[PDB]
Every structure is written in C-alpha cells, then in structure tokens.
Amino acid sequence: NECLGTIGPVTPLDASDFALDIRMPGVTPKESDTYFCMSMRLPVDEEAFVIDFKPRASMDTVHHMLLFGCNMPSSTGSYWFCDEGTCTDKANILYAWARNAPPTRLPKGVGFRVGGETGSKYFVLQVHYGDISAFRDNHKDCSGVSVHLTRVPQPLIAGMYLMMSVDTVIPPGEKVVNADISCQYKMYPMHVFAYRVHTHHLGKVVSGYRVRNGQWTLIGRQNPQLPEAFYPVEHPVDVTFGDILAARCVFTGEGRTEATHIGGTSSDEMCNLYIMYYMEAKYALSFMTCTKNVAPDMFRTIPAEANIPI
C-alpha cells in the first residue's frame, strides 16, 4: 500500500479496540533478497488480544513478511537489516504472508494473548524484498501489516506447537534419511488450523500427523523448498489427551561431502514443523514444543505419502 505519511500508526477505535498500522518507514533496498525489520511497542501495558491481520504488501517487490511478538527487539532503529535476528529473546510467530500462498484467517473468537505481565510487549515485522528491479525508480516502500487488538478477553486463544529434530545425523551420500519427531499430548484440547514447515536445502518432504488408536490424521504435508507461510490445515483436527503428535522430515545425503547435523546455519539442517492452534481460554497455553521421538516404533505404520515427494 501507498506510503502512509504522518497520520499515526496507533488508531483507537473505541474503549476496548485499537488498530496498529505496522509499516516499513519508506525503505529502498539496494540489493536483491534484503531482510528489513522494524518494531512497534504495544501502546497499552495490560493484556490484549490480536484478533485480525490485514497484509499491506506491494505485490511487485515483497516476497514474504513475518510478524513476531517479543519483549526485546534485536535493534532499536526505525528499521534494521535482520538477516541476523528479529528478537534477542524468543520470537513468537503471529503471522506469515507469502506472495503466492493464500493467508489463513484466524477462526472466529480466536486471539493471540499479548501485553500484561507475561505477554509480548513488542511486535517485530520482517519484510523480505526479493527481485528489486521495481526499486530502479528509487521509490520508497511502506509495506507491512494492519493489526486489530482488543482488550475484550477472547473465548479462544491462539498458540504455536513447535515440533523440532535435535539428534538427526545425515551421512554424505545416504539417499534417504528420516528425521522422526513424536510426543504424547497431555493437555486440554487444541484445534489445529494452520501449519508451516522449515528445513534447509537437503529437505525433500515434511509431514505432521495426530495419531489416535493407531489411526494417522494428516495435519500438513509440504515440500520445504516452497515459500514458508502458514498453509491452512485441509481438515482442521482436535488434538486431545492421549493422542500422539508425529512428524517426519525426509532428507538426502547427496551434494554433500561430510556428515550433516542440526544447526542454525544452512550447511547444517533443521527439521521444524510449526502448528498453529487454538484452545479454550480457561485452559490456553500460548506455546508448546516437542524435541523428542517418544514412540519411534509407531512410525512403522506411517502413511506412504510421508516418504514420497510432492
């Protein structure tokens, strides 16, 4: 969208609601694949609920945008190069937009809990500029996201279930290596509505499942070379006490000379699956993780799909 000007990025709408217009401050990338970040302090100290996200992205120039909640942005300037990092503390992902992926909307009555004693005090926006031939005119870009906040307690609360491999060793050559993740779910019900997969270049497919009475129910399955937005869960699924959450990342050892382990760099690999959920407010957890493989023998009946590329 056009460069806002000087209207004010905080718009109070009533006693309980306010819009945050979180936009780049007229930036002009000089090279392709630039990552720009900015932050905005939540303008209340008490608990609030993020209940809507409207993307304001120039189709021409923005490849993707991420919105994070945290307490300690990686820098304090109007904007900053953030190949490096977004937050010094944990970056909680709230929103992802990708040029060609269709953005999931929050289900009705769902919000992310922010502010107050334990919630995020800051939003950090990351904008990825790809092709920059649209900046030949040295024009200024004000891309970002318009966020709707309310102080009204929401009946459903959004969270993030992160499933992540730690021990995986990918030998050189080995055409096929599986990174398997599984945890017992022991909490009140979560309703899974979106997922995001992330690996590095050696990743062929990522799938996650809820397993109940030996039945595998697809949460999501994605080639991890495609853009990394939140894809909608095709048939949104309850995950309940006694279920097993199970994920498999399929890896190759080809194009590589030494053994590849898990690490933050691209020479290292990752197997991450982000599951966006909601829970009933009176039971809600904003975050859960699985870094174990508690039921490795259960993978003997994983569906065929998990082992074949798309």
Ligand SMILES: [Cu+2]
């Ligand atoms: Cu991108």
Ligand SMILES: [Cu+2]
């Ligand atoms: Cu990574």
